[PDB]
């Protein structure tokens, strides 16, 4: 529920993504996963949260 | 050095980005090459699984 970086798994890919409370109206969902590679995805269960939010080192 | 996720600072923004052979894949914004604009703070991060 907090904006930040998290380890997630999406289609078998373990990766770090950024989470924002972005609103996506197609049905409307709040929560967006910003990935390092690939299009953003709504927080609708396709991606599963493994850990986070990660504490930044500075 | 090795491909993986790293904490970097780019334009004052602390963030995790993916490094591949030298290019930085950022969560928001266009990819940027490793030319000194982005400074590596820590990594590569060990995945939890």
Report the C-alpha radius of gyration of chain A, rounded. Answer: 11 Å
What is the CA–CA distance across the termini of chain A? Answer: 22 Å
Strand content of chain A: over 45%
How many helices of chain A in DSSP terms? 0
Tell me the greatest interface. A-B, 18 and 18 residues
Order of helices and strands of chain A: EEEEE
PDB class: unknown function
Keywords: unknown function
Assembly: dimeric
Entry title: Function And Structure Research of Salmonella typhimurium Unknown Functional Protein MicN
Task: Give structural attributes.
homodimer; 58 residues; mainly beta; 5 strands; 59% strand
Your description of this structure?
2 copies of one chain form a homodimer. With 58 residues, chain A is an all-beta fold. Chain A has one domain (4-51). Chain A is built from no helices and 5 strands. Chain A has strands at 4-10, 13-25, 28-34, 41-42, 47-51.
Helix-strand blueprint:
The structure is a homodimer.
Chain A: E1 4-10, E2 13-25, E3 28-34, E4 41-42, E5 47-51
Antiparallel strand pairs in A: 1-2, 1-5, 2-3, 3-4
PDB class: unknown function
Keywords: unknown function
Assembly: dimeric
Can you give me a brief rundown of this structure?
It is classed as unknown function. By secondary structure, chain A is an all-beta fold.
